[PDB]
Structures are given as C-alpha cells and as structure tokens.
C-alpha cells in the first residue's frame, strides 16, 4: 500500500479540481469512482459523467487505466467509454499524477481532437454543429442527475 497512492487519494478528496470528484471503491483502494462535470459552453454542459479508474501493478511507472461509464458522443471516446489520450498511452511520466489525468480528460471535453477514421470523429469533422446537437441530446438522456 504505497505512500504516493494514499497521498494522491487524500489530495483528490481534500483539494479536488473544480468539476472533478474522485474516491476509491471500498473493496479496492486502487479502483476509483470518478465524476466529471460537463464543462460550460460544450454539448456536455450540465451533465454528470461517471468514470472508473484503476491503478495497475506498475503504477506510477505506467499510466492509470481510465474509462467513461456514462455514454457520450465525442470523437475521442468510443462506445465502451475508452479514451484516446496521449498521457494514457505513450506520453506518460511518473511525475504526472491521477490529478493530471482527470484534468486532461476534463480538458478533452472542452477541446475535442477530431484528427486523432471513426464514425463519430468523421461526423464532428463534416458537421460540427450537428454532431454537437447529437452530443447535447445524449447528455440529456445519459448524463442527468435523475
């Protein structure tokens, strides 16, 4: 039970970034429940997004594993909630922490990267406003508090 994981757990609970909430699962200190608020001025505005995060055996030498549990219409997030993000893949460093990952995912909601083949990404390329209209409808359906 590493000192870093405890420190990060406490830091996320005591000083959470605005719009971000993270708490470990009672059965597993390495498995996290995560909420990320839908940023203002996006199709996801007002939405509450659930995610799960896992700290694998080789953390922090390797990145945490993260996926959305709330369905979302976004060029960088697939049908299973998997996220296309550099720091989750190759561009990870032990100097980065869980906090940074969550902030990046949050930033990704405001700044989609539609140049990273997928049907969704192509839809955002050809007609941004219509794709965001679809995304706004999914937000109402899937990301409400009720």
């Amino acid at each position: 039970i590493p000192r870093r994981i405890t420190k990060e757990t406490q830091n996320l609970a005591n000083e959470p970034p605005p719009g971000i909430m993270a708490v470990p699962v009672p059965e597993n200190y390495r498995h996290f429940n995560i909420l990320i608020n839908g940023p203002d001025g996006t199709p996801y505005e007002g939405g509450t997004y659930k995610l799960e995060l896992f700290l694998p055996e080789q953390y922090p030498m390797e990145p945490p594993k993260v996926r959305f549990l709330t369905k979302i219409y976004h060029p960088n997030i697939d049908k299973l909630g998997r996220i296309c993000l550099d720091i989750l893949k190759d561009k990870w460093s032990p100097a980065l922490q869980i906090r940074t990952v969550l902030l990046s995912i949050q930033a990704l909601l405001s700044s989609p990267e539609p140049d990273d083949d997928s049907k969704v990404a192509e839809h955002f390329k050809q007609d941004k406003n219509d794709a965001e209209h679809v995304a706004r409808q999914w937000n109402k359906i899937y990301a409400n508090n009720n």
Partner: protein, 138 residues
C-alpha cells in the same frame, strides 16, 4: 496482491483480442460493440490440421458473468461440432474441459479457446465424423 477489477480485466483481454496479439487459430472480441458490461464474446477457433476438424472455422460464444474472472465463463458453439466436451446443443460441458472443471482466475478467454483447440487433437475426437461444413445447431 493487486486486485484487478472485472471491467479493466475484460478491457485488457479485449485490447489483446482486437489487436491480433493472440494465439494462432483463435480470435475473440465483443459480440456487441456497445456492450458496456463486456459480458458477451464472439469467438472463433480454427480446426486442427491433420484432423477431421481441419480447413474450417468454428464460431462460438463465451459469456462472462458478474463474478468473472473468479468464476468460469460459459461456452457455447454456434457452428455445429462433434466433440467429447460439447453437448448436442453446442454447450461445453464443464466437467469435460479441464480449465472449466477447475477454473483459476488467471485463465483467460484465450486459454479457453486454446484448450478447445487442444481437445481437437485427442484420440477420442481426432477421427470422430463431423456434420457438413458451415452447419448451425437447430
């Protein structure tokens, strides 16, 4: 010990299967592209060369329940196959397959698919006559 949760465990296996980083003659992915629970798996095993199963592909379905990987998944063939470990409806008999009979959490969907390919080589199944190529259960 590090406990890897069901979801991330299945996502790891999915990453392997989707990449093609799999054993020879086996293929596995999700049955539904938007199945968030990652429970229903569409699989394929190739028939062993030099046996009655040779030169044909077998489609099968593997279902991982909520206690996976701590409990064995259920296996069922879609392509018709005559084998000691498969009943008349296509379901794999748990007792007739060693990895399902004594399941360990370290065993994967791949492990199951490979083990079925091994059972093809056994003396009891090797020369056992098969139905026409491409037949489904009815």
């Amino acid at each position: 010990e590090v406990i890897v949760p069901r979801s991330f465990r299945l996502l790891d296996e999915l990453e392997r299967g989707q990449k093609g980083n799999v054993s020879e003659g086996v293929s596995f992915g999700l049955e539904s592209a938007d199945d968030i629970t990652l429970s229903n798996w569409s699989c394929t095993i190739f028939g062993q060369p030099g046996t009655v199963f040779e030169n044909r592909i077998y489609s099968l379905t593997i279902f991982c329940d909520d206690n996976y990987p701590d409990s064995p998944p259920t296996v069922k063939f879609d392509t018709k196959i005559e084998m000691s470990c498969v009943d008349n409806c296509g379901r794999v008999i748990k007792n007739n397959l060693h990895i399902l009979k004594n399941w360990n959490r370290n065993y994967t969907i791949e492990t199951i698919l490979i083990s079925l390919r091994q059972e093809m080589l056994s003396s009891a199944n090797k020369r056992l006559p098969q139905p026409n190529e491409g037949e489904v259960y009815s």
